[PDB]
Every structure is written in C-alpha cells, then in structure tokens.
Design a protein around this ligand. Sequence first.
Ligand SMILES: Nc1nc2c(ncn2[C@@H]2O[C@H](COP(=O)(O)OP(=O)(O)O)[C@@H](O)[C@H]2O)c(=O)[nH]1
Ligand SMILES: [Mg+2]
Length: 199
Amino acid sequence: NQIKVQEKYVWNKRESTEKGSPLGEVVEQGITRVRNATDAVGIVLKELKRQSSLGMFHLLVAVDGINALWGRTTLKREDKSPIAPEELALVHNLRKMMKNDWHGGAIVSALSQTGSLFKPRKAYLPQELLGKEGFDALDPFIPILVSNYNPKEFESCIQYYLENNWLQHEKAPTEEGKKELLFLSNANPSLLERHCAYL
RNA sequence: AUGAGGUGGCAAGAAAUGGGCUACAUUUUCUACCCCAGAAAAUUUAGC
Ligand SMILES: Nc1nc2c(ncn2[C@@H]2O[C@H](COP(=O)(O)OP(=O)(O)O)[C@@H](O)[C@H]2O)c(=O)[nH]1
Ligand SMILES: [Mg+2]
C-alpha cells in the first residue's frame, strides 16, 4: 500500500491499473486472473527496480538456483522444438534485476546443481554451472564459498540433534558413533542430516 | 521314363490338447544426471 505505480498498465480494454494506485492492486490482478499473472510479475520488478533507485525503500533480490537463467530449458513448443530461456517472459524479466544498473539494494544469489539441467553431478564452480553467458551477465560479482562443517560446527549440529532427542540409537550419543557419522558424512551437512534422519 | 516340358485346377472347417511370440507399473514411467532433483500416473515347471 505504500508503494504506488507511476504508469497506467492496461490488462485489457475493460480493465487497467491507473497511475498512482498501490502496487498491491497489480499483485491482486495477477493473483485473481492468472492470465495476467506473468505480466503482473514483470511490472512488479519494473517498479521495484525503479522506485528503489529513487530511494523510497531498500530492495533485496534473493535468487536461489540462479544458474537456470542462462542455461537450457526442457520446455517444448507444439512442434517439439526447444525453447530458449530468454523466450520466457518470467525468465526474461528476472535477468534485468541481476544487472547492476540500479542502486539502493543488493543482489544475493546461490548456485545449485540440484535440479539443474544438462549439468554433471560434480559441477559446483561458478563458471561451470553458469556458462559463458551467465558469467558474462553476472560479472563483476563477489563469489562466497560454502563448505562442509568444520569440527566445531559438526559437534554443535550433533549436539542440537541430541538436544531434540532426534538420535535414538543407543550408540549415537557415544564417541565412536560420532566418529562413524563424521566419516560417513565427511562433515557434509546434507548427508549428515539424511543419515541422522533414520537413526 | 522314377527323365524334360505345355495347359489349366489344387485354396479347405471343427473342437481337445502341447508349445512358441508380444505388453502386463508404483521397488513403476518421462526428463536432467549416472544414485541428495522435478513431474506423470490350486495344480505344475525350473533353479539354486
Ligand atoms: N498486461 C500488461 N503488462 C505489462 C504492461 N507493461 C509492462 N508489462 C509487463 O511488465 C514487464 C516490464 O518489463 P519492460 O520494462 O516493459 O521491458 P520490455 O518487455 O522489453 O518492454 C513487461 O515485460 C511486461 O511483461 C502493460 O501496460 N500491460
Ligand atoms: Mg489348400
């Protein structure tokens, strides 16, 4: 309700959003009529990127699995032809937000090979997952490395699971069980969580 | 002529039994990957 549009958006000949209306209306038009949902998303982005520059609010763009934008799609036409990511309006409008042509906010993203298309299981580095086009788009950027648990973090996570009584095996609270879990997971948070799930 | 040729004709149906070929899925199927993802929907024959 505080954020308001600066243009007249025409959903159809009968319905339009007038200048100065709250942004929520636009969202509502996307939530009520799905036909205009995709058009409603882009407008929101178009507004949020612009108004944040004016200084009305601070904007955070949190995109998880950002590598999808500059890759390949598994969506097909009716002629069984491949569709490129840029041919999707939802993907096309979200690329404009990743460009550093606006101020008043920060862009944070996380890579992900899980659910990625046409990538090997062991690819995790920025260029390998992003592609040349993705690296060129994001460049310049600050990469931040996320690693496996160090011994302090591993011990604290196991203590958290024990405090929640989530390790029911009698040998789990002992020290030998902790060494075995450490070796089996290699301090990987996801493998440790999955192993502790059924113990 | 138990050799070589010409002409036409010869098309088959019933059960009772034996075998063979196909698909038969949720512990499944399609895509990415090659395993931390997303969507769809009783008799009897052998073997160890
Ligand atoms: N239904 C509707 N959608 C709009 C309208 N204006 C912008 N949009 C959508 O909001 C997005 C804003 O992105 P934009 O700045 O216009 O980039 P452009 O598509 O290349 O012109 C567009 O991609 C449209 O999908 C409008 O007047 N009516
Ligand atoms: Mg005959």
